[PDB]
């Protein structure tokens, strides 16, 4: 268990070998666990006919971007 | 680079503070040395628990207020706000 206490902590690893671990730990810890809600706004904006009747189509209703 | 350097210095300081204070309690030392007995990936996975408020990471608050500030600027750049 002496070796168990003495496995090299990150303060003994080379700087790049610990930056490369930080880059992959920060992801799962923060980037992967970050939540933002845009689904109800993206669909609301994608189903909006944007000035289509004012647009000089002179025809039937064009299918919206969601369609 | 700076974040790991400051975290690497703190991990050596927090190891010295246990290696010159291990004779107060052997059992408490055996519990504070689990961090250094854990594999290096797990060490940096548990040292990166600044988010939320469970706060089992032993990292100081001044280093905590550095990643917590970089992460806000990164989302400002990414447009997530």
From Swiss-Prot, chain A:
Detected in heart muscle (at protein level). Heart muscle, brain (cerebellum and hippocampus) and placenta. Induction: By TGFB1. Channel activity is modulated by phosphorylation. Phosphorylation is increased in failing heart, leading to calcium leaks and increased cytoplasmic Ca(2+) levels. It is found in: Sarcoplasmic reticulum membrane. The calcium release channel activity resides in the C-terminal region while the remaining part of the protein resides in the cytoplasm. Cytosolic calcium-activated calcium channel that mediates the release of Ca(2+) from the sarcoplasmic reticulum into the cytosol and thereby plays a key role in triggering cardiac muscle contraction. Aberrant channel activation can lead to cardiac arrhythmia. In cardiac myocytes, calcium release is triggered by increased Ca(2+) cytosolic levels due to activation of the L-type calcium channel CACNA1C. The calcium channel activity is modulated by formation of heterotetramers with RYR3. Required for cellular calcium ion homeostasis. Required for embryonic heart development. Belongs to the ryanodine receptor (TC 1.A.3.1) family. RYR2 subfamily. It is linked to Ventricular tachycardia, catecholaminergic polymorphic, 1, with or without atrial dysfunction and/or dilated cardiomyopathy: An arrhythmogenic disorder characterized by stress-induced, bidirectional ventricular tachycardia that may degenerate into cardiac arrest and cause sudden death. Patients present with recurrent syncope, seizures, or sudden death after physical activity or emotional stress. CPVT1 inheritance is autosomal dominant. Homotetramer. Can also form heterotetramers with RYR1 and RYR3. Interacts with FKBP1A and FKBP1B; these interactions may stabilize the channel in its closed state and prevent Ca(2+) leaks. Interacts with CALM and S100A1; these interactions regulate channel activity. Identified in a complex composed of RYR2, FKBP1B, PKA catalytic subunit, PRKAR2A, AKAP6, and the protein phosphatases PP2A and PP1. Interacts directly with FKBP1B, PKA, PP1 and PP2A. Interacts with SELENON. In cardiac muscles, identified in a complex, composed of FSD2, CMYA5 and RYR2. This is Ryanodine receptor 2. The gene is RYR2. The chain holds residues 3599 to 3665 of 4967 of the full protein.
């Amino acid at each position: 268990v002496v070796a168990c206490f003495r496995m090299a902590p990150l303060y003994n690893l080379p700087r790049h070998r610990a930056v490369n671990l930080f880059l992959q730990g920060y992801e799962k810890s923060w980037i992967e666990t970050e939540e933002h809600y845009f689904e109800d706004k993206l669909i609301e904006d994608l189903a909006k006919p944007g000035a289509e009747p004012p647009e000089e189509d002179e025809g039937t209703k064009r299918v919206d971007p969601l369609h | 680079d700076d974040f790991v350097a400051k975290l690497q210095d703190n991990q050596r300081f927090r190891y010295n503070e246990v290696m010159q204070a291990l004779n107060m309690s052997a059992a408490l030392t055996a519990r504070k040395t689990k961090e250094f007995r854990s594999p290096p990936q797990e060490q940096i996975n548990m040292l990166l628990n600044f988010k939320d408020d469970k706060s089992e990471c032993p990292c100081p608050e001044e280093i905590r207020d550095q990643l917590l500030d970089f992460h806000e600027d990164l989302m400002t750049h990414c447009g997530i706000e």
